[PDB]
Amino acid sequence: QAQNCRLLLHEEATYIYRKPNIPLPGFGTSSPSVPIATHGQLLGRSQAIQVGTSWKPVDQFLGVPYAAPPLGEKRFRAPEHLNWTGSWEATKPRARCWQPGIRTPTPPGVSEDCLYLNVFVPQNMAPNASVLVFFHNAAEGKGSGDRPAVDGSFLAAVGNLIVVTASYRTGIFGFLSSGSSELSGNWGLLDQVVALTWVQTHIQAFGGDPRRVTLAADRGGADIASIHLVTTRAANSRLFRRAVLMGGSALSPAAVIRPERARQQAAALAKEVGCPSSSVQEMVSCLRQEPARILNDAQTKLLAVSGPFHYWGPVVDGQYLRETPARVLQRAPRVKVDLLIGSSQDDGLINRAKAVKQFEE
Amino acid sequence: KSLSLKIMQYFSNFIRSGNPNYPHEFSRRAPEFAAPWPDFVPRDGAESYKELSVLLPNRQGLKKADCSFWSKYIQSLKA
Amino acid sequence: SQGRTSSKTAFSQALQNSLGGDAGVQAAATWYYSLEHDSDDXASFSRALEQATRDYFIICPVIDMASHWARTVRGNVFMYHAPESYSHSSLELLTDVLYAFGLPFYPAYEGQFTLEEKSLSLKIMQYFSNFIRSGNPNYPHEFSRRAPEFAAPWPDFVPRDGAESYKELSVLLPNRQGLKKADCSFWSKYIQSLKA
Amino acid sequence: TARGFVNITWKLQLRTQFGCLEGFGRVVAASDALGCVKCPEG
Amino acid sequence: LRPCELQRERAFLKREDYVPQCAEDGSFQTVQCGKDGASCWCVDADGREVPGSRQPGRPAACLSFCQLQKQQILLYLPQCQDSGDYSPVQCQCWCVDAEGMEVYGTRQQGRPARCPRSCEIRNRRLLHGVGDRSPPQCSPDGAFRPVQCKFVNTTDMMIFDLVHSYSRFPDAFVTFSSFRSRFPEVSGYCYCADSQGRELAETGLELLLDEILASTFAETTLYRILQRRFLAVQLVISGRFRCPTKCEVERFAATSFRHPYVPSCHPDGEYQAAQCQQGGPCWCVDSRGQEIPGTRQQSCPSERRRAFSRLRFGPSCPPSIKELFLDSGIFQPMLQGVAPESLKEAIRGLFPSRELARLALQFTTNAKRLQQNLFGGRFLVKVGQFNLSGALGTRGTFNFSHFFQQLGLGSFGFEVNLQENQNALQFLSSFLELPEFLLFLQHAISVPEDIARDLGDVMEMVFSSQGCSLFVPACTAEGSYEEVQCFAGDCWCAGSRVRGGRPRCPTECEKQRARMQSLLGSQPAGSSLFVPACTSKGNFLPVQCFNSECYCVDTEGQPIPGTRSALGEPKKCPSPCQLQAERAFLGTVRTLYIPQCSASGQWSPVQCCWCVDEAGQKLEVPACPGSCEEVKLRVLQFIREAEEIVTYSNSSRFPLGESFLAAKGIRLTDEELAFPSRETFLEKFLSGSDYAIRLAAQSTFDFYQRRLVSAYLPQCDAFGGWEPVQCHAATGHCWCVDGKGEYVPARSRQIPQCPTSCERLRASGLLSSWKQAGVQAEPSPKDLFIPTCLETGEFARLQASEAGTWCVDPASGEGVPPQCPSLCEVLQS
Amino acid sequence: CWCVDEAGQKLEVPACPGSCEEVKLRVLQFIREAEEIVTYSNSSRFPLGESFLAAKGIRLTDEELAFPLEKFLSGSDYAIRLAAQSTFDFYQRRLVSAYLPQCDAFGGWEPVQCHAATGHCWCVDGKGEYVPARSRQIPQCPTSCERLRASG
Amino acid sequence: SSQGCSLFVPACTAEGSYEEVQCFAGDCWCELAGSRVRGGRPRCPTECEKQRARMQSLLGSQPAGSSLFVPACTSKGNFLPVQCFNSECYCVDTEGQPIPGTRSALGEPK
Ligand SMILES: *[C@@H]1O[C@H](CO)[C@@H](O[C@@H]2O[C@H](CO)[C@@H](O)[C@H](O)[C@H]2NC(C)=O)[C@H](O)[C@H]1NC(C)=O
Ligand SMILES: *[C@@H]1O[C@H](CO)[C@@H](O)[C@H](O)[C@H]1NC(C)=O
Ligand SMILES: *[C@@H]1O[C@H](CO)[C@@H](O)[C@H](O)[C@H]1NC(C)=O
Ligand SMILES: *[C@@H]1O[C@H](CO)[C@@H](O)[C@H](O)[C@H]1NC(C)=O
Ligand SMILES: *[C@@H]1O[C@H](CO)[C@@H](O)[C@H](O)[C@H]1NC(C)=O
Ligand SMILES: *[C@@H]1O[C@H](CO)[C@@H](O)[C@H](O)[C@H]1NC(C)=O
Ligand SMILES: *[C@@H]1O[C@H](CO)[C@@H](O)[C@H](O)[C@H]1NC(C)=O
């Protein structure tokens, strides 16, 4: 019907005075040119959302980069600060990552430059609001170029919080490891720990609070997300206070793939596309030329669970992730991270590969 | 639309306070929008969760029979 | 009477004698029935072990034989299950042999059995006499298929998973289906496969 | 009062005629409804 | 001491025939009594007896001290509170202690907003310099903390001053290590304190401080550790993790002084609901001990009333505590591993205030480590085995020597169940190092203070909801929640809700059967214990066997002396009628109705006179009806009831809607509607039953048939026996019945002729040799006979068998006391 | 013509009630129904068995009784309330109440609703939905817009 | 005919015609399963709810990972205004029949 807010007071009082909220520099208008340090203005847009019968204006900065577009030779290597400047037109959702089983020809709005995080900040609210870094790769169908796949304006409004909806590269592009010293890594886990430092640094510019981030993640991509609860950062700069894992955990069987499996799980790909899988330096340097379309028609072929069932996931590499998540969780707690974990009965390893089967047909 | 609006408050109380029942971490006023979400304790007597159905009812023992097979029996068989 | 009683050795010995006498079958049964042999309480370990031994020895073989008698047709089959009755200890006879033989009506046991028990025993004596006479508990004469009036018809046991009926020797004498699907599925399929 | 209790009146702040707290002053309402406004500065 | 105890102690030593009873606070009880409760005269604070009171017994709530001092002035007036005690602030508008003499510095023009309690005065009165320089530990509300603790200088035995040492050296008290390095020769000394703060007797327990910022020392962790150890040591001594309560100090004193009024209490500590002075009247009492204004000699009606209000509104369990504590396993493991009492108070001794538990649960983060922090080590476990006695305990005032002289190597009238206390103290130890406990504190802290004042009261209200629409409960006299509640067809007594008929309460037999069945689940397989068997109605079965030894039992399942024969041998034991006879004999001579039973044991037909059925149940010299005549009187009474309904409606005496309410079991009461036979009519419908539906249908049919312009009564013979052929009397489907109305297997021609009671019986005995007994007492196979029926159908006069012949009455095959009696001749007697 | 609510369902120029007045016509109709019962009983053309039998859903049809209740046949709590009001009245008013909401002049819910007798004066939103006691100072609660403004 | 199947009297509509909602002793069911409502009255399953249940039951046959149309019904029982199958949503009339035109793709206001 209508949303009815009212203050909580420790005890009755005669006169009650509340100071109005002063918008941060940039907000207030309908083109909130947020100035984020060392880059310049990041001008988004505003949209009014209806929940009951009542509307809340919500600013929306869709397509805020957090890393240089992993195109070309920056493909199977960790991300790095985009170093942009001037004025970013963060008003339109950007291309979503390549995922297994993308219908051919490549539809609009899928590309390797998919390291963009949408921010949905209500108009004016408490000084230090909380944040929710939801790591979500939009599906093939969701999104119409005007609106993002998962809007998040409606959770932001009915919670009075900021909702960052970061995307990240998954599949071979994110995780094409070889367990070795030259190409091992989880680039998609290194570039979703870069969307959390961005939220750490430049979220004060919006209404947010760096000390109250809440790393969330959905089906399947919550096995990747939950690897942050077991990776050891510097331990002086925590990147989140809580964790809402919807449909996965660090302890699942495929939360990390063994090196000897990873080493051969990419030799299959390299052979499949046509690269010489002799040495990694010569192999990876060949995949770096293959167009994404040809290189993502390969992983969907290897990834179908009736033949190979090659799943790509966070390898252990010593540098970022050093011990298997089961063995890391044996050690004693060091920081108290809340957890709202869960699952759905509609889930299932065959439901997540729905796009792959339709491709196999 | 009404169930979703009770779960956008469980997930917004958690993002704010760390306990879906309470929207502020310095005020333990009980929730009124929906039934309390009980903390998950691993004791077999009662390990409650929240069935995200229309009534949002708490239940217990999500899959005792099936996740004792994988966790207890099969994990033994792995050795 | 000889003095020696349960001990720490017995707990892991009894389970081994009862269910083994193999190493994998014991693990499967220990998980399935949660036989915590380490737990040193006969009150619960034994209470959960009698169930395993009953399933293995007493109640699944009397379903395996009923199914094998009906399938490779050797003649009619009528299965019954007599639910747990907490009343009559001190008679070394369980509730299907002290109902099929008219124990309630004995002069010695006058006043120990309720009239409900005596009536149920009379119905069950009629079932067993009909079986002994005609070969089909419903019909007392093998040349007259008049339907029984004393109690509900006893359905023939057909081994199809859709419905394999039996008679629950309780006060109402109701037909039921699927005596122990889960536990006898365990013993008959998984354990038997694991034998190889 | 020692027993748990000439003109004796047991008036209970919230036979049995309603009244009000002194200083408020009842209203034309005789005996029923709302009554006994708070007496203003006058 | 006080003005009393000096008088009280003197009387006991001298043996004068009166001891001036005085409660805690060392103040004379308003109502004293004589040496043997002969004449209780009420007095005032000084000790003088009121001239107008010497009556035998107990004076009717004599006037309190405040008024007894007030009325003295009339021949400033103290303002006596409603309870009869001085108001906290007299009125110059000063305020006063709880004795009458004003607190020192409180003379004011207007009423003080709030002036000190009994402790804050002592502390301030200590700075001014009257008393030993150790401030009593004050509860936050201002009262004395139950467990006082004053350090002692081990050299020369002078109390160690603390208004000075703490004032100048506050850092020394940060921890026990620091304290020892500053005052090595100090050995703490904790004791219980009464309401006035005075040291209790032989309860001091001189701790040892060797091996173990805030202000006032009543908040420093030294004290809270130094009293958690004291309470732990008390759990062993007394069995409860707390000091003796206000009731127990008085009860111990009463038992010790053997005076007439010994107060009664239960281990909760609160005053028992009703204290019964021996040698006089009893009376209910509140928590403070004040007699209820009159009671000299449970919550349904309120609930009933509230439900009615919800009906009056017309068209248009604690809150959120069951599904956070009980649902999830934050509570269920708490009780399991003794009593709610030892678990209630094990969280007031620990965590005295909610603002502390919050501190405790954020500086521990380790369930196992919690018991180390709270007690400064593994104390309580070391207390169970008395490892303390040498480690911490020491010469104080408790005489561990005497305590152990009764043991192997009570405090305030507490019987010491040493094994249970060792079990209970151990219980706390494992309970405290329990991961679920930390969650409980996180929730118990959250619950609003209004519904639970402190963590102790938080725990009761969650114990009280362990299990926990438009329904109104019924009520019997004096509240007394009625046994069987009906609503919308449902009727439940409370694990059995059955539709339609009014259910039967579980008899004692059924309760015992269920309890023993539940206790059977614990027993190891192959072992058995006694599970008494109950009949259909609910009575104990005549014979109860356990193992090869069967003993016939009386009405309430108690073995009868003798008749303890072994299993498997006929045991002839008292018939139910004789058991009822003896039971009623005992019941009716124990209060200073007799059922008389036929010699054979069966219920005699006439009981008193009146007549009853063979089960002995009451049936409305009066000759009694036969097998069918009674079944006919039932139908006649039913038609009478239907006509009564119709002629009640024809009198317009009953509201149209009430009959509906009965169907829903909301028959409202005439206690709350004293305006009015109204009840009598509603009894028929209230228990929604097939009989009620049939009666309503018959009444409606009659009303709508005979207002403007049937029931099958059975046909019977001349002697009240069922006619063989029963016809419905209209479009009859003439079925035929046996000798007791039980139908034995259509508008057909030639209405069937069916055999009389003996032609059926003779045909049975001829076809299948199911013969009939002749003597009924273990007949030989020769005593059996097949009845011989004369032509028309009745039993032949004389029935024969291979063993002999006897005369039977043609009505039924039942012998008669003896040529051969004939029908008219047998009917003559 | 006639008028319906915004769901299109029939609502018994025919200008017709607002948010509350319709909720008040229900209560007025209810008391009318309750009084209809008491006067039928006073006229005594119905037997008690009829009311009970209807309570069990076994009403009798005039087709099989040609000689010559919809309230009671549906065993709903509304029927329970109606019968309770009927019987309470009969006895009370033979030998010798319902909360109807207070409304404004335009048919809109009055902000503060009072039970009118030992009232626990709660207050409602602009559609009668209660928004969070025999207390003094029967509370003043915001009108429809003072609630929207305070939220906004 | 024996397939499927105390003091209860059924109601009757004109010319026999077994009446829809039979009530007795506080129960009321419209027999067909999933209708016993203790107190009050039940609602006869609308056309939508019948098609929902049939399609839900037919769903159990479909292999996991594949789906088909299961029309969704409002609280009362009417078809929802819009029925989607796979990225193609059509607004439906009262009895769940697509309206000509108005067959836009999923994820765009209609
Ligand atoms: C009995 O109590 C004694 C003394 O309190 C305990 O001896 C101490 O043991 C603890 C750890 O158990 C050590 O940290 C101390 O150093 C010991 N102190 C002394 C003086 O011995 C003893 O452990 C307790 N238990 C038994 C079985 O004696
Ligand atoms: C960003 O610019 C700085 C110079 O200000 C340079 O040192 C740094 O390497 C640049 N990053 C990239 C990705 O070029
Ligand atoms: C809260 O808000 C201000 C800016 O409005 C920020 O500078 C401050 O650091 C925040 N609070 C804390 C504890 O940091
Ligand atoms: C305890 O007694 C001795 C006696 O000489 C005294 O000197 C000492 O000061 C007292 N203790 C302290 C800590 O002062
Ligand atoms: C302890 O108890 C005995 C019991 O008679 C008593 O004689 C003894 O004096 C007591 N000892 C102390 C120190 O009080
Ligand atoms: C009811 O009363 C009227 C007179 O008041 C009488 O004429 C009629 O016969 C009566 N009917 C019955 C069934 O008693
Ligand atoms: C209706 O009830 C009134 C009040 O008791 C009574 O006076 C009157 O007689 C009744 N109606 C008739 C026709 O009796």
Residue numbers in the entry:
A (entry chain B): 2168 to 2528
B (entry chain B): 2649 to 2727
C (entry chain A): 2529 to 2549, 2553 to 2727
D (entry chain B): 1326 to 1330, 1364 to 1372, 1436 to 1453, 1458 to 1467
E (entry chain A): 31 to 105, 116 to 131, 137 to 257, 267 to 351, 362 to 380, 408 to 428, 434 to 505, 549 to 607, ...
F (entry chain B): 898 to 909, 918 to 973, 983 to 1010, 1025 to 1060, 1065 to 1084
G (entry chain B): 603 to 607, 613 to 637, 644 to 723
Q: What did the original publication write about this model?
A:
Thyroid hormones T3 (tri-iodothyronine) and T4 (tetra-iodothyronine or thyroxine) are essential regulators of metabolism, development, and growth in all vertebrates and some invertebrates. T3 and T4 are formed from the precursor thyroglobulin (TG), a ~660-kDa homodimer specific to the follicular lumen of the thyroid gland. T3 is formed when the mono-iodinated phenolic ring of a donor tyrosine is transferred to a di-iodinated acceptor tyrosine; T4 is formed when the donor tyrosine phenolic ring is also di-iodinated. In addition to being the site of hormone formation, TG functions as a reservoir for thyroid hormone storage until it is trafficked back into the thyrocyte and degraded in the lysosome, liberating T3 and T4 for secretion into the bloodstream.
Here we report a ~3.3-Å cryo-EM structure of native bovine TG with nascent thyroid hormone present at the predicted hormonogenic site B. A cryo-EM reconstruction was obtained with a ~3.3 Å overall resolution and a ~2.8 Å local resolution over a substantial, presumably more rigid part of the complex, sufficient for building an atomic model. The structure is essentially identical to that of recombinant human TG6, including conservation of multiple glycosylation sites. Close agreement between the density map and the model confirms that the acceptor tyrosine is 3,5-di-iodinated (top), as required for thyroid hormone formation. The map for the transferred donor phenolic group appears ambiguous regarding iodination state (top), as might be expected if the map includes a mixture of donor mono- and di-iodination states (corresponding to nascent T3 and T4, respectively), heterogeneity in the orientation of the donor aromatic ring, or both. Tandem mass spectrometry analysis (LC-MS/MS) confirmed that there was a mixture of nascent T3 and T4 at position 2573 in the TG sample. At the predicted donor site (bottom), the map fits a dehyrdroalanine residue but does not appear to accommodate the original tyrosine aromatic side chain, whereas the map makes a good fit to other side chains of the loop containing the donor site (pale blue), including the aromatic side chain of the immediately adjacent residue F2439. The nascent thyroid hormone at hormonogenic site B is accompanied by a substantial alteration of neighboring structural elements as compared with pre-hormonogenic human TG6. The helix-loop-helix motif formed by residues 2515–2548 (dark gray-blue) is substantially reorganized, rotating F2539 (green) by ~80° and displacing it by ~9 Å from its initial position. This rearrangement moves the acceptor tyrosine (red) away from its close apposition to F2576 (gold), flips the residual donor site far away, and packs the double-ringed reaction product into an interior pocket bounded by α-helices.
